[PDB]
């Protein structure tokens, strides 16, 4: 809601504008009376460890121009770092972490740390943020025998996210879910973000990763656009598509079958976020249902 | 940058009238150490019955640059919800027996009450941070007897300190978690006692509706309890039951660990300002004898 | 401290449409040096006739973190006051002949107009600092001919720089003072020119009601004057008289000192933003020429 | 008008408070609704060169609690230092500087310097201050033959001072006056401050000096109170009341003849001002009508 452009906000806004067209684009967003949620942004765990300042800076820009994102982040790399320090190797199937009781302890502790890290970086920039670490995702077991403490999300409770935004604070969420009776269950961040998007139907849906999209492994070329109805089935049969990419793309396809056809998902690097959000950039991989 | 209005400064002056009161305030106003001003436990009933006065008093503390650690309960509204759905509340030794359905009600109630308090504060211009999990680590108190109830074994200070450092009042629930991530129900008086133990605040305050503890055998409010002299005999009295017994027990165990200079005030919210700014306690004061 | 509202940012965006314009704004927005963005001379009449527009335009500049040096006149208010007293205004070569009584009137009017503008700015949330003396030191221009009229010999920058450093728009009169403290009257166009000479600002703007200079022999507004080619011929034209003649000469002598990249814009307040943010001038532009 | 207590303002207020009586004294000023000007404060020129931080700091306290003083400063000592360096002996009669053309140029320069020094120190503390160096005092020649460029003040134009206060800025004045036709005339700062106090009829009238009051030259002791109706005539016959002190005492006597008997004037060091204004300390020299 609250628009308050600091010196850094003004510089961020102007520094890459070069045309009337770009100016007009920003004017359209700043004069908008829409009540639609602006954005759900999924943040790769690696970005919080490697690229915190940059992440905090673009989130701060959005905050200062009154366009609050719902932010959901992962924690995969730092979990593997802790397990390795303890002489334990991680285990996945279908891109999903097999999560026994000891692994869940590490996952929970790492999520809390990395969540607070991001919230604090934001507060150090004068951006109000709330760590939302429980009470959003209710889940049952995806498959206890196979994955152990891994959740299948059944419902999203919106009130803590909306209360945060209403209070003027960015809601910063982990992908942890809970059963009704309170057993925490690990969920993949790509999946949890998609559930948020499903229920909020935001203007913008963004997945931030380091590669800045999805890279065709046979050619090495970045895939600019994916038309799911045409390309999904045979894209998934390609042997270069890694488990994590397969999980990501499956979730997005399911998400976009629910959302209206006007919705889309951008998979992009954080340095290209502003131009993709505001000035209609072709950076990253854009994914839509299509025909 | 901190600033205070005329009304805030006037109310501040109205609370301070001696050199030691001034010094106490300024000591905590400009945080020169990791020392904490207050742990304030809020009875759940206050959030449903007297929220505006609770929020206003906490908002005054914030506006004079003080950041109490606030932890609230939710027992009465859990009891309300259960009775509303035709389920009778289930306690033993003052502790709620918490099966799988009861825990879902407790969690949802905790979160609702928490957001209610946080939002009332925000509406008064107070930055408040919900801290609903991640502080209390527990194992099962007694599975067979209480089911999903915790016995706290550690307090993680970071989220509370981070909140204060960001200039927001931390508003905590008493939910705890096992290492493996099973949330457990903990009595809010007990949890508050665990916070006081690790933070060693200047002030330890429990807010209830009665404004202290009443002696059942006489019908008179108890002004002071000297534990070393009175605890053993007091716990034998048959009028001392349920939640009260549990409250006195935890406070006794807390004050055994804290220095003799510490004390615990059980008061009504209308006595909070006087209890925090002066040594002339109100309600029921408890100290080591 | 700095923050900008939505409507401030919207208005900034409406003023910028090229990369060059962005880099120009950013250069002056982020400056930690003594470089100056603008000297803006305000015609006295505008304070009587169109104050709110003037004050709003200056407020926008302040709200985007730009700190123009503002110097204003008061000629027409003085003439009205003299005529209210049954005194005929007395000019030669565009300069007011200023005896003791007239100096009292000029001083009072100047201080009044100054406080009028400063207060209008403050009402819009703009910090503005009256600077009514201590800037211009002067000798007598010609005591027999003009009486209490000054020829400016130095400009003290300190009061203006301190205002800007504190985040306040400096609002100046053109009153000057002898070393020993006799105030001397100076034409506001000339004093503004002296300010431009020592500050060498990016932008030199003269605000008048006509939005430039009209060629008397055609009735057409002059869009551009290239002084090297046109100045001698122009000053021989019979329609070039009084205050307009003085203004042109003063601008010419100013531009003899400044680099060829400089220019002076004589415009109406409605064109101030365009003139400040873009290279597409308005009204009457004056330069040396290439 | 605008009350806004900063961190340092709160500490400044409470630091010295030990009793309920002191508290109630501050409550009286903070709950007040009277339209009367709070204070006229004369600042000896030396304080601006010698103890500027401390001066800026107590003025800042008054600003932040919404009790704006009208501030008038001198510059006598630094003019003498300038003259000294040019090989010129300072020239005084009856505590008033004889001021020829050269000396007026020094006085003027050096007034503007001290004025801007004070204004800038206030602004650095986040206090809005407006330099008011002309347009307040209109004067005739005091005695051209005897004093040269020295003024006798005939009127005080209030508008600039009231406009500054209304805008939220402390008005910081020099004592320079001007004739109708614009010859600047030098006026002693003690006299100009008296002329301000006459027309503003403030609640408090304070003269700040480094000595911290007036010293009885014969006994070698600070004078705490002067009852003028009783003491004035004999005081003016004492050998140790000459130069500025004589001028000051006479100007204060004439001021308190015009003002009601409830008014008084304090002469004090800046370190004792807060306690003097708010909690009736009895430091420095208090002067009043008496009987
Ligand atoms: C179930 C599962 O795979 N959880 C992910 C969540 C963290 C993330 O996505 O970065 C994990 O790595 O444990
Ligand atoms: C274990 C237990 O009794 N917990 C409390 C928590 C709420 C409170 O203390 O207000 C309960 O009523 O469930
Ligand atoms: C000397 C001289 O002509 N001064 C001008 C100054 C006012 C103005 O320029 O608006 C005058 O009118 O007296
Ligand atoms: C006339 C006169 O004596 N003026 C004083 C003004 C400065 C002051 O009072 O400090 C002077 O010393 O010149
Ligand atoms: Cl960005
Ligand atoms: Cl860990
Ligand atoms: Cl209240
Ligand atoms: Cl419920
Ligand atoms: Cl509920
Ligand atoms: Cl306008
Ligand atoms: Cl000097
Ligand atoms: Hg960890
Ligand atoms: Hg509930
Ligand atoms: Hg309180
Ligand atoms: Hg305008
Ligand atoms: Hg006039
Ligand atoms: Hg000097
Ligand atoms: Hg003071």
Numbering used by the authors:
A (entry chain A), D (entry chain C): 62 to 352
B (entry chain B): 63 to 351
C (entry chain D): 63 to 352
Quote the paper.
A truncated form of yNAGK spanning from residue 58 to 356, corresponding to the AAK domain and lacking the C-terminal DUF619 domain, was produced as a soluble protein in milligram amounts in E. coli. Four crystal structures of truncated yNAGK, ligand-free or complexed with either NAG or NAG and arginine, were determined using for the initial phasing single anomalous diffraction (SAD) from a Se-Met derivative. Four subunits, organized as a dimer of dimers with D2 local symmetry, were found in the asymmetric unit of these crystals. In the crystals containing NAG, one NAG molecule was found in each subunit. As reported in other NAGKs (best studied in EcNAGK), NAG is bound in a pocket in the N-lobe under the closed lid formed by the β3–β4 hairpin. Despite the different oligomerization of yNAGK in relation to other NAGKs, the AAK domain structure closely conforms to the canonic α3β8α4 sandwich NAGK subunit fold, with the N-lobe spanning residues 96–272 and the C-lobe residues 273–350. In yNAGK, the β5 strands of the two subunits still interact with each other, although they are parallel due to the large rotation of one subunit relative to the other. At each interdimeric junction, a four-helix bundle is formed by both interacting “stands”, burying an approximate area of 910 Å2 per subunit. In any case, the interactions mediated by these stands result in the association of two yNAGK dimers into a relatively flat rectangular tetramer with approximate dimensions of 35 Å×109 Å×83 Å. Two active centers, separated by a distance of 80 Å, are exposed in one diagonal on each face of the tetramer.
The first step of the route is the production of N-acetyl-L-glutamate (NAG), while the second is the phosphorylation of NAG by NAG kinase (NAGK). We report here structural and functional studies on the arginine-sensitive NAGK from Saccharomyces cerevisiae (yNAGK). The structure of the mature yNAGK, lacking the N-terminal mitochondrial targeting sequence (residues 1–57), reveals an unexpected novel tetrameric architecture, which can be described as a dimer of dimers with D2 symmetry. The AAK domains occupy the center of the molecule flanked by two pairs of interacting DUF619 domains.
